[PDB]
Amino acid sequence: EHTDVLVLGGAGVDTIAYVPELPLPFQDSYVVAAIEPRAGQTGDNVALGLHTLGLRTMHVDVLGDDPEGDLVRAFHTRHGLPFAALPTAAGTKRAVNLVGPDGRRLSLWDGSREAEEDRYPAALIAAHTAHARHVHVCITPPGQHVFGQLNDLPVTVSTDLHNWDGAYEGFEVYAFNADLVFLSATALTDVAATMRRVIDRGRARLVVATDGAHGGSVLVRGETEVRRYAAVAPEAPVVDSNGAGDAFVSGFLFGHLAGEPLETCLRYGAIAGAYACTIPATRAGAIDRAALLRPA
Amino acid sequence: HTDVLVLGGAGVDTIAYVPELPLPFQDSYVVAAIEPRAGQTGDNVALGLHTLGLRTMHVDVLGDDPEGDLVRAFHTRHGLPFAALPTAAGTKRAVNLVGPDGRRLSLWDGSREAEEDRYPAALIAAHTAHARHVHVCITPPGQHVFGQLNDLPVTVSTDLHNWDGAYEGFEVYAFNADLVFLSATALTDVAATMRRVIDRGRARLVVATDGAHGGSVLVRGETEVRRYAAVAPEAPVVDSNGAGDAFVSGFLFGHLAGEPLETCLRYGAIAGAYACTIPATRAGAIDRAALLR
Numbered sequence: 277e278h279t280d281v282l283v284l285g286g287a288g289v290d291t292i293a294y295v296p297e298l299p300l301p302f303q304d305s306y307v308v309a310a311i312e313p314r315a316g317q318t319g320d321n322v323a324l325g326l327h328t329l330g331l332r333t334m335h336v337d338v339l340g341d342d343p344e345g346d347l348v349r350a351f352h353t354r355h356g357l358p359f360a361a362l363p364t365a366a367g368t369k370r371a372v373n374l375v376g377p378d379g380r381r382l383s384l385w386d387g388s389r390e391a392e393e394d395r396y397p398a399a400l401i402a403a404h405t406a407h408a409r410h411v412h413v414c415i416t417p418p419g420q421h422v423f424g425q426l427n428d429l430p431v432t433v434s435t436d437l438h439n440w441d442g443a444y445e446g447f448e449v450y451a452f453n454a455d456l457v458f459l460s461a462t463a464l465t466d467v468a469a470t471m472r473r474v475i476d477r478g479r480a481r482l483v484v485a486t487d488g489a490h491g492g493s494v495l496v497r498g499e500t501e502v503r504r505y506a507a508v509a510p511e512a513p514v515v516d517s518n519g520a521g522d523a524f525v526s527g528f529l530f531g532h533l534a535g536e537p538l539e540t541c542l543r544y545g546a547i548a549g550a551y552a553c554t555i556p557a558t559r560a561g562a563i564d565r566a567a568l569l570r571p572a
Numbered sequence: 573h574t575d576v577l578v579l580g581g582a583g584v585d586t587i588a589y590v591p592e593l594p595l596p597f598q599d600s601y602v603v604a605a606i607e608p609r610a611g612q613t614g615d616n617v618a619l620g621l622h623t624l625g626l627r628t629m630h631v632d633v634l635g636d637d638p639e640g641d642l643v644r645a646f647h648t649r650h651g652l653p654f655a656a657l658p659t660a661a662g663t664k665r666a667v668n669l670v671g672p673d674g675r676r677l678s679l680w681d682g683s684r685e686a687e688e689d690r691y692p693a694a695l696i697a698a699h700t701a702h703a704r705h706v707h708v709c710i711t712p713p714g715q716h717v718f719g720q721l722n723d724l725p726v727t728v729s730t731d732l733h734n735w736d737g738a739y740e741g742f743e744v745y746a747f748n749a750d751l752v753f754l755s756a757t758a759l760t761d762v763a764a765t766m767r768r769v770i771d772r773g774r775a776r777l778v779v780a781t782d783g784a785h786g787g788s789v790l791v792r793g794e795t796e797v798r799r800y801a802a803v804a805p806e807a808p809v810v811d812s813n814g815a816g817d818a819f820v821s822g823f824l825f826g827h828l829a830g831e832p833l834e835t836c837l838r839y840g841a842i843a844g845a846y847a848c849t850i851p852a853t854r855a856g857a858i859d860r861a862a863l864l865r
């Protein structure tokens with residue numbers, strides 16, 4: 277009856293423009309397809325994905341009194357996602373993304389959408405974790421202040437560092453206080469080294485470094501060699517690779533909370549990620565339980 | 573009341589400031605504030621003419637959009653008389669990448685058109701009764717309005733923007749306007765395109781802007797194209813979006829005031845230079861005082 281998985285942060289709005297190619301050669305203007313601001317940033321996708329897979333999720337994030345804020349509220353209402361909007365003077369998180377015909381995405385992340393005085397109230401975290409098994413913390417503020425509290429709780433914690441430097445100190449509090457750490461490998465100087473470093477802090481059981489259509493790589497606590505997983509071919513054209521890594525997290529966690537072995541969890545993630553690559557910005561979509569369990 | 577009737581061009585730009593154009597491929601950049609704003613070609617011309625002290629009226633189709641909200645708020649805030657016609661296609665919109673030098677890569681939404689849309693003749697006739705001039709933006713249903721305008725006692729201007737000089741859809745605008753403005757960025761043969769507007773159309777003069785290099789003008793009855801020089805902005809160049817529209821505003825302010833061609837060209841250059849100094853975080857147009865000295 278209560279929250280099974282608490283999702284912290286990551287609520288926002290992407291404005292997608294489909295472009296002929298990336299990098300886009302300079303002109304005064306291109307005529308593009310329909311431009312339509314939608315909710316569905318990393319916190320929105322992890323929530324939707326987990327909920328579509330049948331888990332009782334709660335989603336909490338700071339939210340502006342914005343037209344962007346309206347979109348996020350409507351997103352959760354539309355997909356039946358339990359949601360708590362916290363006030364903030366900074367405004368709702370935004371990005372402008374350029375999507376190529378191959379599904380590749382160039383995100384322009386608004387970095388002004390932070391108020392240092394924002395906090396996820398301790399009582400709210402406590403209320404939604406009273407019977408919960410897992411908390412996913414998005415790397416958006418004020419997520420950096422929540423791990424003193426979560427570390428004392430009988431729940432597992434996961435995070436997604438996305439295109440982490442491997443060096444940028446800001447993501448460390450996330451990377452070093454999470455049992456399951458996810459991240460992309462596109463901005464890593466040394467993938468293997470970053471993965472080993474996250475493990476050498478003595479908290480994470482595994483690290484996953486995703487590599488798009490190549491699948492990705494994983495490192496398990498106490499193991500020396502990194503493992504790979506294969507990407508799954510989508511049953512539809514790759515249109516928009518936005519939310520794939522979030523879909524991967526959702527799929528993986530579904531298997532994690534169901535006691536599945538690592539390889540199955542990785543399989544779930546890959547299938548969910550491939551599905552997400554086939555969804556336009558014109559609709560919101562997350563893979564369903566039945567389809568996730570369909571391949572062998 | 574009204575001096576100038578502005579038709580079309582009501583829309584919303586979403587600006588993202590980027591380190592360089594063209595933008596090399598990365599998964600993500602961290603950029604400054606992204607804040608959708610009203611102020612496409614029609615909104616800017618209206619505000620420019622209004623700021624300079626002319627009596628304006630702006631008419632365009634508008635969607636029951638969040639974008640529509642921004643547009644309506646814009647006209648109210650700046651006190652621009654405005655009449656929104658309903659449309660099912662939605663409010664026009666673009667995503668613009670703006671570099672540190674003010675250069676802009678616009679991403680125009682070409683889906684915001686409904687073929688059944690029309691400017692109602694009775695609304696057109698009503699606002700052309702006392703108007704001396706009508707400016708028609710090249711957005712639909714603009715292409716259906718020149719039959720009525722042709723029989724009215726008003727001068728007509730238009731702005732063709734980054735026209736091919738070949739795309740047939742703009743020809744109805746280019747060939748039925750007293751004053752034809754356009755950008756020269758996409759022109760293979762600037763001079764030929766200008767003369768073609770003179771010969772096939774009824775333009776009394778044609779202006780092909782060229783950004784910081786000024787632009788080109790061709791006058792009916794003359795053989796050679798003239799040049800005008802750009803004026804340096806008096807504040808840092810931030811966002812060149814709206815420069816061309818400001819040029820039209822400054823030019824018309826003098827044109828409707830019977831000022832010589834050289835004076836009108838100069839006003840536009842100043843107005844356009846000023847336009848490049850306004851952020852996407854503010855709406856701004858040059859006033860009478862700053863323009864006249």
Ligand SMILES: C[C@H]1O[C@H](O[C@H]2[C@H](O)[C@@H](O)[C@@H](O[C@H]3[C@H](O)[C@@H](O)[C@@H](O)O[C@@H]3CO)O[C@@H]2CO)[C@H](O)[C@@H](O)[C@@H]1N[C@H]1C=C(CO)[C@@H](O)[C@H](O)[C@H]1O
Pocket residue numbers: 290316317318321371372373383384385387388390415416417437438439446518519521522599600602
């Ligand atoms: C979710 C988001 O995470 C990442 O964004 C982080 C930045 O990369 C960090 O640099 C940091 O931003 C700070 C600035 O660096 C700093 O100058 C200051 O302005 O404060 C900023 C915020 O504290 O932290 C950011 C997160 O808070 C990543 O780069 C970004 O791409 C990620 N968003 C993507 C996710 C999805 C779907 O998964 C899309 O909806 C978005 O469009 C993507 O941009």
Ligand SMILES: C[C@H]1O[C@H](O[C@H]2[C@H](O)[C@@H](O)[C@@H](O[C@H]3[C@H](O)[C@@H](O)[C@@H](O)O[C@@H]3CO)O[C@@H]2CO)[C@H](O)[C@@H](O)[C@@H]1N[C@H]1C=C(CO)[C@@H](O)[C@H](O)[C@H]1O
Pocket residue numbers: 304305307585611612613616666667668678679680682683684685710711712732733734741813814817
């Ligand atoms: C005002 C706008 O004019 C120009 O846009 C025109 C396109 O260039 C044409 O191709 C045509 O678009 C049609 C498509 O070609 C067609 O495939 C179909 O999708 O229908 C479309 C609409 O009929 O007509 C367009 C005008 O509606 C120009 O390219 C564009 O850049 C101009 N907009 C700029 C104006 C300003 C200055 O303030 C900025 O606000 C905008 O961001 C600029 O993009």
Ligand SMILES: Nc1ncnc2c1ncn2[C@@H]1O[C@H](COP(=O)(O)OP(=O)(O)NP(=O)(O)O)[C@@H](O)[C@H]1O
Pocket residue numbers: 318379438459460461486487488489490491492506507508509510514517518519520521522523524545546547548549550553
């Ligand atoms: N083009 C593709 N074809 C097939 N599978 C894909 C493709 N792109 C991604 N995937 C799968 O989805 C996973 C996530 O992709 P990836 O691009 O690495 O995530 P991401 O960049 O973090 N997406 P996001 O949630 O928007 O930050 C990969 O590990 C693959 O399993």
Ligand SMILES: Nc1ncnc2c1ncn2[C@@H]1O[C@H](COP(=O)(O)OP(=O)(O)NP(=O)(O)O)[C@@H](O)[C@H]1O
Pocket residue numbers: 613674733754755756781782783784785786787801802803804805809812813814815816817818819840841842844845848
């Ligand atoms: N950087 C600049 N410095 C000085 N004057 C400028 C600058 N950029 C533009 N101008 C002036 O503004 C005029 C119009 O600029 P231009 O870029 O040609 O119009 P535009 O691109 O169509 N703007 P827009 O309304 O967004 O379509 C030029 O002829 C100059 O007089």
Ligand SMILES: [Mn+2]
Pocket residue numbers: 436437438439460521522
């Ligand atoms: Mn990611």
Ligand SMILES: [Mn+2]
Pocket residue numbers: 731732733734755816817
């Ligand atoms: Mn223009």
Ligand code: NA
Pocket residue numbers: 516517518519520552553554555556
């Ligand atoms: Na997608």
Ligand code: NA
Pocket residue numbers: 811812813814815847848849850851852
């Ligand atoms: Na500007």
